[PDB]
């Protein structure tokens, strides 16, 4: 019978480095590497999943944790990877976008193209969850990303925000327009150069995303693949959402500069607060140029503003 165990970052660090002699060649998809020893054949994945195989399955297993569970499980590509394995190696447009969610400011939708020889470069600078990245962060490195790599962008102002809102168009629309209309600046700015694959992470199921294009003048289909969580299938999504976050940071501080008053992240009491001292300080009709107006927040703070 094999052997399944869930392993933390630390117990695969230590799996990787025990066994002298592990292979990380021609792999199943989603496994980081396999042992092979007498009797049993370990395969670890990025899952966190580890397979033990053999007679000596349960005995090894044992060596590094207790309640291993008997499985019927086999050593084979993992669904989550399928993607990846298949994807993370070429070269490829990836886009993501920013401040959806956000009182303040635009909808920033971003790509870049990755091109085979710069995907390692970008890896370097440390692109591996991007969303942990402080803001300091993503100033020092999104340059240096945009310097490497071809990319485009595409800001959606407030004023074209709230008049888009307001004449019916929900967000999930917005980004697909956006993200549509990025693509092709970004295809036609690398052409003659082809991407062996378009990667757009999953705000919404493909069906819709498409249906909300077909007024669209010019739409990117070929090679286009919607997928969850994207930024770990390709480098491209990574680059794609730190540059968007880059370009957002900078459309929120000459945003403030034209308000005159410096505009928080979020959509949390502190942006009711803020909200309240624009509008008296600037009027009512400043929030148009600056905030995203059907939200909760212009409500709590029309009645701030005017109690007192």
Same mark, same amino acid.
């Given at each position: 019978s094999n052997y399944v165990i869930q392993a933390d970052q630390q117990l695969l660090d230590a799996l990787r480095a025990h066994y002298e002699g592990a292979l990380s060649d021609r792999l199943p998809a989603g496994a980081l590497f396999a042992v092979k020893r007498p009797d049993v054949v370990i395969t670890a994945y990025r899952s966190g999943k580890v397979l033990f195989a053999g007679k000596a399955a349960e005995q090894e297993a044992a060596k590094w944790i207790s309640g291993a569970s008997a499985s019927n499980e086999t050593a084979d590509h993992q669904p989550s990877a399928l993607a990846a394995h298949q994807l993370g190696s070429l070269s490829a447009i990836g886009s993501d976008e920013v401040g959806t969610g956000d009182y303040f400011g635009p909808i920033v939708v971003a790509a870049a193209y990755v091109d085979r020889p710069h995907i390692a470069k970008i890896a370097a600078l440390g692109v591996k969850d991007s969303k942990q990245l402080n803001d300091e962060a993503i100033k020092r490195i999104a340059p240096a990303i945009m310097e490497t790599v071809p990319h485009a962008v595409t800001v959606l102002d407030n004023p074209q925000y709230n008049r888009w809102q307001r004449s019916g168009m929900p967000q999930t629309k917005m980004k697909a327009l956006l993200h549509n209309r990025t693509l092709v600046k970004l295809v036609d700015a690398i052409a003659p150069a082809e991407p062996e694959a378009i990667i757009i992470d999953e705000f919404l199921k493909r069906d819709s995303y498409f249906r909300y294009l077909?007024? #669209?003048d010019r739409i990117i289909r070929e090679r286009v693949h919607c997928l969850p969580k994207a930024e770990s299938v390709h480098v491209s999504v990574a680059a794609a959402s730190i540059i968007a976050r880059y370009v957002f940071l900078e459309?929120?501080?000459?945003?403030?500069?034209?308000?005159?008053?410096l505009l928080p992240k979020g959509a949390g009491a502190i942006v009711d607060e803020a909200a309240a001292r624009i509008i008296r300080a600037r009027g009512e009709?400043?929030? #148009?140029?600056?905030?995203?107006?059907?939200?909760?927040?212009t409500k709590k703070a029309l009645a701030i503003a005017k109690r007192r």
């Open positions: 077909s007024d #669209e459309e929120m501080e000459q945003l403030s500069r034209a308000v005159g008053l009709e400043m929030l #148009e140029t600056c905030a995203k107006l059907h939200f909760a927040n």
